[PDB]
Write a protein that binds this ligand. Structure first.
Ligand SMILES: O=C(O)CCC(=O)C(=O)O
Ligand SMILES: [Mn+2]
Length: 345
């Protein structure tokens, strides 16, 4: 239910580094530090691609589970995940998901080489394919603007983040939540996203809650194995209902942005409440290149790094341990690539 109104920004099509760009970047940073999230206005193309992707998702989800379950690959984690498979803080989650990772044909040199997680999306139909690809291209353009403004706002060289996101490992979760069916309303537990930057779109049903930064509340560093943020604060105020709003996307930082900024930005915790109707949403992750390593921006003498490909691959093997994708990584020793990439990229 509606409480807070989020701040809304209109991004320039191109970010050049002029003083107004820097001021806008500072305002985005401040909004994340106060509210944990903000809105960015969409134009006619951004909105059209959003609506067409949501419409394709709705059509696909009405297919029988036998067909949806066939949309899997043993090369990439792209494709279908049935409801009740994903687990957050020991409890299974309710949405069914189609993950879209980088769509690489078997003729790509990385797929020929057997790099872990590299392969073609198992698209369910051509309308779904075209809708998601064009939506993700548009989302990527916004991701790059946001990353240049964020660097500028921190008085960093304009290409600090975008140097890491060339051919970035961008991917998207296409979600459908069922209607509530019992007194249980926890659609997904409280958690933080593992990536760099998150851009989210939703239908008009409502159910996403986010947690702003809280004075006096210590936050875990979810990229470290003993400091999971899963389930933390789920039942503590404050949680901000993200009111469905036509003509916007929302944006919040992930774990990698928390890591690189040394906690000046916090990975925003979020959770979803089931509603009386099914609910559709998309979460887009604007990510480093598979071969890029994140590093702390404000501690130049720190050795800590996050190699992104290793980070992603470990996360997905642990989240979907029995997927055919994980089994083929283990069978073919595809993780061996990671050590050579760290040394000879
Ligand atoms: O449903 C949303 O709006 C947020 C995306 C989500 O549920 C997730 O964290 O995977
Ligand atoms: Mn999430």
């Amino acid at each position: 239910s509606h409480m807070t109104n989020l701040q809304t920004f209109e991004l320039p099509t191109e970010v050049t580094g002029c003083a107004a760009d820097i001021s806008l970047g500072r305002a985005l940073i401040q909004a994340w530090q106060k509210d944990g999230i903000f809105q960015i206005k969409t134009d006619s193309e951004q909105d059209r691609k959003t609506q067409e992707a949501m419409a394709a998702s709705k059509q696909f989800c009405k297919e029988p589970l036998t067909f949806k379950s066939s949309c899997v690959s043993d090369l990439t984690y792209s494709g279908y995940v049935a409801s009740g498979e994903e687990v957050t803080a020991g409890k299974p989650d309710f949405p069914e998901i189609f993950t879209v990772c980088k769509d690489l044909s078997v003729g790509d040199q990385r797929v020929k080489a057997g790099w872990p997680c590299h392969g073609p999306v198992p698209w369910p139909n051509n309308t779904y394919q075209k809708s998601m690809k064009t939506f993700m291209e548009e989302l990527g353009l916004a991701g790059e603007r946001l990353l240049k403004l964020t660097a500028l706002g921190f008085e960093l060289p304009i290409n600090t983040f975008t140097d890491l996101t060339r051919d970035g490992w961008h991917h998207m979760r296409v979600l459908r939540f069922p209607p509530q069916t019992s007194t249980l309303s926890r659609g997904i537990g409280a958690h933080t996203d593992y990536g760099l930057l998150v851009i989210a779109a939703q239908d008009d049903v409502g159910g996403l809650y986010i947690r702003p930064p809280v004075e006096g509340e210590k936050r875990n560093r979810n990229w470290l194995p003993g400091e999971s943020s899963a389930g933390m604060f789920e039942h503590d105020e404050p949680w901000t209902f993200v009111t469905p709003t036509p003509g916007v996307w929302t944006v919040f930082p992930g774990d990698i942005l928390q890591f690189m900024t040394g906690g000046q930005l916090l990975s925003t915790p979020h959770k979803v409440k089931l509603n009386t109707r099914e609910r559709f949403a998309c979460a887009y992750f604007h990510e480093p290149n598979f071969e890029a390593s994140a590093y702390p921006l404000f501690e130049p003498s720190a050795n800590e790094r996050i190699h992104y490909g290793e980070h992603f691959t470990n996360m997905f093997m642990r989240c979907y341990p029995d997927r055919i994708t994980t089994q083929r990584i283990n069978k073919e020793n595809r993780l061996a690539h990671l050590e050579d990439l760290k040394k000879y990229s």
